Amino acid sequence: GYCATKGIKCNDIHCCSGLKCDSKRKVCVKG
DSSP, rough: OOOOTTSOOOSSSSOOEEEEEEEETTEEOOO
């Protein structure tokens, strides 16, 4: 469907298979 891509907050939403959820910046980053 549509996950949280780079630059998108991951405080709750998860990123698509291939991205990491930066718990430090509360956002998705490159894997």
